C-alpha cells in the first residue's frame, strides 16, 4: 500500500504464507477450523521472529570476532510495549506481511491488537531505556540492555465509579514469543551472610544463594541487519533450597519473589527490602556476565577499553561497590588499581531533582543484606572525603554535605553521591536540568570535579514514534524528501521549504484529520464514548503527579465550563479535553486527582447547554500501545509542569513529531524544543525557574491569588461546596486544602497566564491554514529530539566509541 512500509515481492509473500501455515500447524498445534484471532497473531509472530534469528546469531558472532568495546546499559525498567510491528518495520517486512495475511483472509491490524504490551516500566525512564536500545542497534553499537524480567509489569488501570482500581498485569499468561530462555547461563547471586577477615583479604561467607536465569530478547536496528540483545534476569531457588519437606518446597517462593513485580512508583523513593534485593540481583548477575565476556576475549588494565557500564539513575548503583568487591576480593587487585578501573568503566545518568525521588538507603538494611558492600562503601567514602579535605581545607560543612553517609535519626547512604564519586561522567537529561544539577543539588561535586559533568538531552526513536504509529504522516513526508530521514531525523529541516506549499498544507491537515477520526472510532468501539472529531483535541497524557499539574489543566477546564454557562450563546472553539495516566497505588493525592477529573466529566459531559462544545474524557490504562494511538490524534500537547521539576520529558517530543502544537512552561526539554522551533511557534507561559526561586524566597501565599482572581475564587467555592460531588459535598476538601495551604507546585501562580495562553491557542485554531503552517514548523525542527542524536553523543562523549550506519550482510 504505502512506500515506507517496504516491498511486497511475490517470492517473499509466498514464503511468509507457507511459514505462517507451518507455524499454525506444527508450533501452535491448531487447524484453521478452530483457530482464533489469538492463534493467528501467534502464527504471525513466530513467522516474523524466524527472520530475526540468522541476523541475531550473526551479529553476536561478529562481536565475538571483532571484539569491539561493549556497552552495558543497566536499568531496572525497560518499557518496551509491543514488538510485532516494530520488528516488521525494522526488517522492512510490513507490506509483505500485510499482503501475506490479506491473501490468507486476515486483517493484520486486528492481529497486532492482540499482542500484550511488555510493560516493564513506569513511564518516561523505562521508555527512554527502550528508545535507547532501538537507537544503539540502529547505530551499530555492541550494546546490551540488562534488567529484570518481572512476572508482573505496571498494573492495568480500571476506573470504577471514577476511582482507580489496580489489576495485576499478567503479561506472560499466553507466552512471550519474543524471548528465549537461557537456563544454561544461570548464575548465582548472594545475600545476607557475614564478612570474615583472613590473612589473604576479606571473605563473604554464610550467604543465602538465589539463582539468576537469563531470558534474551532481540533488539533489531533499522534496516541494517544488526540484532542486539536485551538480557532480563529471573529469580530461581536452588534445588537444595530449604533442604518439613512440603513446606520447604513451598518456601521456594521467598527467593523467587525477587523478580515477581515491578515497583509502581514513578519519582517516589520507598526504602523496602524487596526493592533493594531487586537492585542487587540485577547488578550481581550482570557483572558476572560482563566479566565472563571480558575474560573470553589477568590484565584488568584494559577493562575500561573493552567495557562501558551506563547506570540508568541510581537504581543499579550497587554496580560500583560490586565491581570493587569482585576486583579486590576475588581477583585480588589492589584497591587503588580497582578504583581506577571502576571509575573509568562507570557512568551515571541522573533523571530527577525532586528530593523524595532520591535513593537514600538505611544503613541497617545494607548491613544485614549486603555486609561486604557496606564496608566497601565506607572505605570509598573515607578516601573520597580525604580528597575533599585536601582540596577545600577547613571546610567542614562541605565534608558533611558531600559525604556518602547521611547522619541523622537513621543513618542512610546517599546513592547519588556514591554514583558521582565512582563514575567518570555524570549527566542530566536536558540542558536546563544539567545546569540545575551544577548550580544546586550537586554544586559541591561540580566544584571538586567539573570535568565529570555533562548534558545529554533526551530523545525518542522515530521508528516507533513516527513510522510505526503515524504511517500517513511518514508517507507524505517521504513523498517530498525521501526515506533517509527515518535514520537521520535532522533531514526534516528540508520541510521548511514546504511551509507555503498549498498541497503539503492540505496533506498535513488531512493526515491529522484521519488520525482523529480513527481515534474517535476507537473510543466509541472499545469504551462506548462519543466525541466530536472537529473539536480541538487537547491532550495531557503522563503519569499522575502533583508536579505535572494535571490540576492546573482541571482549573482551566472548569473555567471554560463556567464561561460557557455564563454566556451560553457566545461562540467558543469546541474542545475535547483528554487526560490520562496512572497513579501510584499508595499516592492518595494522585488518586483524588483522577477522581476529580472523572467528576468534572460527569458534570460537563451531561450539561445540555454545553452541547458538544466541551467534552472531558479520562483515558483509562495509559500505556505505550495507547500512546501510539492518541499521540497521532492530538492537536494540543499539555506540558505544564512547574518550572524546574520535569527533568526532561519525552512525551513532549512525541507530540512535536506527530503534528501537535505545545502549550507549556519553560521546563525540561520544552526549553530546547521552543529554541529549535522558535518561540513564536510554541505556546509558552508561566514562571521561569528564576521566578519560582523569587516566589520561594518571599513565600508562596496561595490566598493572594484566590483574593485577586474572581474566576479562580468561583472554582474553589464550587469544589469546596460540592458542585462536582452532590452526594458527598466534602469529597474534594483534601484538594482544596492542599491548593490553599500546602502547594509545593504553585498551581495558582501560573493560572492567569495559562488561561490567557489557552485563549491564544483557541484563536489560532480558528484559522486552520495558519495552525497547520505552525505545525509544519514544529515537525520540521523536531530532528534534534531523535534518540539517534542522543546515543551518538553518549557514544562519542562518554563511552568512547564511534557509531556506524553501515549494514551487516543479510
Ligand X SMILES: *Cc1c(COP(=O)(O)O)cnc(C)c1O
Tell me how far, at minimum, the Cβ of 77 lies from ligand X, in Å.
Answer: 11
Tell me how far, at minimum, the Cβ of 131 lies from ligand X, in Å.
Answer: 9
| 297 annotated binding-site participant | yes
647 is in the binding site of which of ligand X, ligand KS3, none (Cβ under 5 to 8 A by kind)? Answer: ligand KS3
* Active-site annotation holder among 275, 463, 512, 543: 543
Q: Which residues on neighbouring strands pair with residue 360, listed in sequence order?
A: 414
654 is in the binding site of which of ligand X, ligand KS3, none (Cβ under 5 to 8 A by kind)? Answer: ligand X
Tell me how far, at minimum, the Cβ of 526 lies from ligand KS3, in Å.
Answer: 29
179 is in the binding site of which of ligand X, ligand KS3, none (Cβ under 5 to 8 A by kind)? Answer: ligand KS3
Chain breaks in the chain (C to N over 2.5 A) after: 243, 297
Work out whether strand 201-205 and strand 194-198 pair parallel, antiparallel, or are unpaired.
Answer: antiparallel
Q: Which of 6, 124, 632, 644 binds ligand X (CB under 6 A)?
A: 124
Q: Which is nearer to ligand KS3, 375 or 670 (CB)?
A: 670
Task: Report, in this order, helix, strand and coil percent for the chain, each rounded to 5.
Answer: 55, 15, 30
Tell me how far, at minimum, the Cβ of 432 lies from ligand X, in Å.
Answer: 15
Instruction: Name the DSSP letter for residue 74.
Output: E
269 is in the binding site of which of ligand X, ligand KS3, none (Cβ under 5 to 8 A by kind)? Answer: ligand KS3
Element (H, E) at 72: strand 70-74
Does position 624 bind ligand X by CB under 6 A?
yes
* Helix axes of 550-566 and 588-604: crossing angle, nearest 10 degrees: 20
* Torsion angle in degrees (nearest 10) through CA of 757, 763, 768, 773: -40
C-alpha cell at 718: 464550587
Q: Which is nearer to ligand KS3, 77 or 538 (CB)?
A: 77
651 is in the binding site of which of ligand X, ligand KS3, none (Cβ under 5 to 8 A by kind)? Answer: ligand X
* Active-site annotation holder among 82, 277, 373, 542: 542
Handedness of CA 430, 436, 442, 446 (dihedral sign): positive
| Residue ranges that bind ligand KS3, judged by CB under 6 A | 49, 52-53, 122, 124-125, 128, 178-181, 218, 263, 265-269, 351-352, 357, 429, 458, 646-650, 668
Does position 649 bind ligand X by CB under 6 A?
yes
- Burial label, 479 (beta-carbon count in 10 A; 0-12, 13-18, 19+): middle
Is 543 catalytic? The answer is yes
Does position 542 bind ligand X by CB under 6 A?
yes
| 64 annotated binding-site participant | yes
Which residue's CB atom is positioned nearest to ligand KS3?
181
Tell me how far, at minimum, the Cβ of 616 lies from ligand X, in Å.
Answer: 19
Q: Which is nearer to ligand KS3, 30 or 180 (CB)?
A: 180
Q: Confirm if 624 and 82 have CB atoms less than 8 A apart.
A: yes
CA 241/CA 252 separation, integer angstroms = 7
352 is in the binding site of which of ligand X, ligand KS3, none (Cβ under 5 to 8 A by kind)? Answer: ligand KS3
Q: Confirm if 137 and 228 have CB atoms less than 8 A apart.
A: yes
* Active-site annotation holder among 51, 277, 351, 512: 351
351 is in the binding site of which of ligand KS3, ligand X, none (Cβ under 5 to 8 A by kind)? Answer: ligand KS3
Q: Enumerate residues 6+ apart whose C-beta is below 8 A from 498.
A: 480, 504, 776
Tell me how far, at minimum, the Cβ of 490 lies from ligand KS3, in Å.
Answer: 21
| 773 annotated binding-site participant | no
Q: Which of 342, 650, 665, 670 binds ligand X (CB under 6 A)?
A: 650
Q: Which is nearer to ligand KS3, 355 or 699 (CB)?
A: 355
Q: Which of 221, 471, 651, 659 binds ligand X (CB under 6 A)?
A: 651
Q: Helix H segments across 392-428?
A: 396-402, 415-421
Q: Confirm if 143 and 131 have CB atoms less than 8 A apart.
A: no
| 102 annotated binding-site participant | no
Q: Which of 48, 467, 593, 627 binds ligand X (CB under 6 A)?
A: 627
Q: Which is nearer to ligand KS3, 329 or 646 (CB)?
A: 646
Distances (CA, A) of 636 to 102, 449, 471, 532: 36, 42, 20, 16
- Burial label, 406 (beta-carbon count in 10 A; 0-12, 13-18, 19+): middle
CA 542/CA 129 separation, integer angstroms = 17
Q: Enumerate residues 6+ apart whose C-beta is below 8 A from 277.
A: 191, 258, 369
224 is in the binding site of which of ligand X, ligand KS3, none (Cβ under 5 to 8 A by kind)? Answer: none
Q: Which is nearer to ligand X, 49 or 582 (CB)?
A: 582
Q: Where are the beta strands (DSSP E) in 530-605?
A: 536-541, 575-580
CA 219/CA 143 separation, integer angstroms = 10
| 655 annotated binding-site participant | no
Backbone Cα Rg of the chain: 27
Tell me how far, at minimum, the Cβ of 654 lies from ligand X, in Å.
Answer: 6
User: Cell 500546602 belongs to which residue?
Assistant: 742
632 is in the binding site of which of ligand X, ligand KS3, none (Cβ under 5 to 8 A by kind)? Answer: none
Q: Which of 51, 93, 94, 123 binds ligand X (CB under 6 A)?
A: 123
Q: Which of 23, 49, 127, 613 binds ligand X (CB under 6 A)?
A: 127
Q: Which is nearer to ligand X, 140 or 649 (CB)?
A: 649
User: By rule CB under 6 A, what count of residues binds ligand X?
Assistant: 12
Is 654 catalytic? The answer is yes
Q: Which is nearer to ligand KS3, 262 or 326 (CB)?
A: 262
Q: Confirm if 97 and 104 have CB atoms less than 8 A apart.
A: no
Q: Enumerate residues 6+ apart whose C-beta is below 8 A from 443.
A: none
Instruction: Name the DSSP letter for residue 631.
Output: G
CA 703/CA 696 separation, integer angstroms = 15
Q: Which stretch binds ligand X (CB under 6 A): 107-115, 121-129, 175-183, 750-758?
A: 121-129
C-alpha cell at 444: 559541591
Three-state SS at 152: strand
Does position 654 bind ligand X by CB under 6 A?
yes
627 is in the binding site of which of ligand KS3, ligand X, none (Cβ under 5 to 8 A by kind)? Answer: ligand X
Tell me how far, at minimum, the Cβ of 627 lies from ligand X, in Å.
Answer: 4
Tell me how far, at minimum, the Cβ of 565 lies from ligand KS3, in Å.
Answer: 37
Three-state SS at 236: strand
Q: Which is nearer to ligand X, 150 or 281 (CB)?
A: 150
DSSP-assigned letters across all residues of 769-786: HHHHHHHHHHHHT-GGGB
Q: Confirm if 627 and 642 have CB atoms less than 8 A apart.
A: no
Q: Confirm if 747 and 551 have CB atoms less than 8 A apart.
A: yes
C-alpha cell at 214: 537469563
| 296 annotated binding-site participant | yes
Tell me how far, at minimum, the Cβ of 128 lies from ligand X, in Å.
Answer: 8
Is 542 catalytic? The answer is yes
CA 810/CA 52 separation, integer angstroms = 11
Residues tagged in the binding site annotation: 31, 64, 292-297
Contact residues for ligand X, defined by CB under 6 A: 123-124, 127, 542, 623-624, 627, 649-652, 654
Residues marked active site are found at: 351, 542-543, 548, 650, 654
Residues tagged in the binding site annotation for AMP: 31, 64, 292-297
Amino acid at each position: 500500500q504505502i512506500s515506507v512500509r517496504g516491498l511486497a515481492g511475490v517470492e517473499n509473500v509466498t514464503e511468509l504464507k507457507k511459514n505462517f501455515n507451518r507455524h499454525l500447524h506444527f508450533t501452535l498445534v491448531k487447524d484453521r477450523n478452530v483457530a482464533t484471532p489469538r492463534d493467528y497473531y501467534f502464527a504471525l509472530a513466530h513467522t516474523v521472529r524466524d527472520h530475526l534469528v540468522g541476523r541475531w546469531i550473526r551479529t553476536q558472532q561478529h562481536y565475538y570476532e571483532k571484539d569491539p568495546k561493549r556497552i552495558y546499559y543497566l536499568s531496572l525498567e525497560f518499557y518496551m510495549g509491543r514488538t510485532l510491528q516494530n520488528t516488521m518495520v525494522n526488517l522492512a517486512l510490513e507490506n509483505a506481511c500485510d499482503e501475506a495475511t490479506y491473501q490468507l483472509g486476515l486483517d493484520m491490524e486486528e492481529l497486532e491488537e492482540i499482542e500484550e504490551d511488555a510493560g516493564l516500566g513506569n513511564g518516561g525512564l523505562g521508555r527512554l531505556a527502550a528508545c535507547f536500545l532501538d537507537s544503539m542497534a540502529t547505530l551499530g553499537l555492541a550494546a546490551y540492555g540488562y534488567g529484570i524480567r518481572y512476572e508482573f509489569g505496571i498494573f492495568n488501570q480500571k476506573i470504577c465509579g471514577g476511582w482507580q482500581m489496580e489489576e495485576a498485569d499478567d503479561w506472560l499468561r499466553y507466552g512471550n514469543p519474543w524471548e528465549k530462555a537461557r537456563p544454561e547461563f544461570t548464575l548465582p547471586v548472594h545475600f545476607y551472610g557475614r564478612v570474615e577477615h583472613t590473612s589473604q583479604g576479606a571473605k563473604w561467607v554464610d550467604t543465602q544463594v538465589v539463582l539468576a536465569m537469563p531470558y534474551d530478547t532481540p533488539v533489531p536496528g533499522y534496516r541494517n541487519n544488526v540484532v542486539n540483545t536485551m538480557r532480563l534476569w529471573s529469580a530461581k531457588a536452588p534445588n537444595d533450597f530449604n533442604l518439613g519437606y512440603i513446606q520447604a518446597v513451598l518456601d521456594r517462593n521467598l527467593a523467587e519473589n525477587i523478580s515477581r513485580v515491578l515497583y509502581p512508583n514513578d519519582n517516589f523513593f520507598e526504602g523496602k527490602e524487596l526493592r533493594l534485593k531487586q537492585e542487587y540481583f540485577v547488578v550481581a548477575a550482570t557483572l558476572q556476565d560482563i566479566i565472563r565476556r571480558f575474560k573470553s576475549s589477568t590484565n584488568f588494565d584494559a577493562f575500561p577499553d573493552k567495557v562501558a557500564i551506563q547506570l540508568n539513575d541510581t537504581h543499579p548503583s550497587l554496580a560500583i561497590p560490586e565491581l570493587m568487591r569482585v576486583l579486590v576480593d576475588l581477583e585480588r587487585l589492589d584497591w587503588d588499581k580497582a578504583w581506577e578501573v571502576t571509575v573509568k568503566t562507570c557512568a551515571y545518568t541522573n533523571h530527577t531533582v525532586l528530593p523524595e525521588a532520591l535513593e537514600r538507603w538505611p544503613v541497617h538494611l545494607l548491613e544485614t543484606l549486603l555486609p561486604r558492600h557496606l564496608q566497601i562503601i565506607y572505605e570509598i567514602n573515607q578516601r573520597f572525603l580525604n580528597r575533599v579535605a585536601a582540596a577545600f581545607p577547613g571546610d567542614v560543612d562541605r565534608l558533611r554535605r558531600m559525604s556518602l553517609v547521611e547522619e541523622g535519626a537513621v543513618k542512610r547512604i546517599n546513592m547519588a553521591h556514591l554514583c558521582i564519586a565512582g563514575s567518570h561522567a555524570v549527566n542530566g537529561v536536558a540542558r536546563i536540568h544539567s545546569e540545575i544539577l551544577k548550580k544546586t543539588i550537586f554544586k559541591d561535586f561540580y566544584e571538586l570535579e567539573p570535568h565529570k559533568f555533562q548534558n545529554k538531552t533526551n530523545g525518542i526513536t522515530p521508528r516507533r514514534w513516527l513510522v510505526l504509529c503515524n504511517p500517513g504522516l511518514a508517507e507524505i513526508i517521504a513523498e517530498r524528501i525521501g526515506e533517509e530521514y527515518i535514520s537521520d531525523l535532522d533531514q526534516l529541516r528540508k520541510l521548511l521549504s514546504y511551509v507555503d506549499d498549498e498541497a503539503f498544507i492540505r496533506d498535513v491537515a488531512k493526515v491529522k484529520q484521519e488520525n482523529k477520526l480513527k481515534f474517535a472510532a476507537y473510543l466509541e468501539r472499545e469504551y462506548k464514548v462519543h466525541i466530536n472529531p472537529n473539536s480541538l483535541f487537547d491532550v495531557q497524557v503522563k503519569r499522575i503527579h502533583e508536579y505535572k499539574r494535571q490540576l492546573l489543566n482541571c482549573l482551566h477546564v472548569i473555567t471554560l465550563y463556567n464561561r460557557i454557562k455564563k454566556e451560553p450563546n457566545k461562540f467558543v472553539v469546541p474542545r475535547t479535553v483528554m487526560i490520562g495516566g496512572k497513579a501510584a497505588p499508595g499516592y492518595h493525592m494522585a488518586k483524588m486527582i483522577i477522581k476529580l477529573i472523572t467528576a468534572i466529566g460527569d458534570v460537563v459531559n451531561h450539561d445540555p447547554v454545553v452541547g458538544d462544545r466541551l467534552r472531558v474524557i479520562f483515558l483509562e490504562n495509559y500505556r505505550v500501545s495507547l500512546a501510539e494511538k492518541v499521540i497521532p490524534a492530538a492537536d494540543l500537547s499539555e506540558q505544564i509542569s512547574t518550572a524546574g521539576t520535569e527533568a526532561s520529558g519525552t512525551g513532549n517530543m512525541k507530540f512535536m513529531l506527530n503534528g501537535a502544537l505545545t502549550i507549556g512552561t519553560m521546563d525540561g526539554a520544552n526549553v530546547e524544543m521552543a529554541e529549535e522551533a522558535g518561540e513564536e511557534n510554541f505556546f509558552i507561559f508561566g514562571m521561569r525557574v528564576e521566578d519560582v526561586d523569587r516566589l520561594d524566597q518571599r513565600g508562596y501565599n496561595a490566598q493572594e491569588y484566590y483574593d485577586r482572581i474572581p474566576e479562580l475564587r468561583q472554582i474553589i467555592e464550587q469544589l469546596s461546596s460540592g458542585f462536582f460531588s452532590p452526594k458527598q459535598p466534602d469529597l474534594f476538601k483534601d484538594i482544596v486544602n492542599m491548593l490553599m495551604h500546602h502547594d509545593r507546585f504553585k498551581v495558582f501562580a501560573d493560572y492567569e497566564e495559562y488561561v490567557k495562553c489557552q485563549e491564544r491557542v483557541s484563536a489560532l485554531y480558528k484559522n486552520p491554514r495558519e495552525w497547520t503552517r505552525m505545525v509544519i514548523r514544529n515537525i520540521a525542527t523536531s530532528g534534534k529530539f531523535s534518540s539517534d542524536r542522543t546515543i551518538a553523543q553518549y557514544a562519542r562523549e562518554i563511552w568512547g566509541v564511534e557509531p556506524s550506519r553501515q549494514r551487516l550482510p543479510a
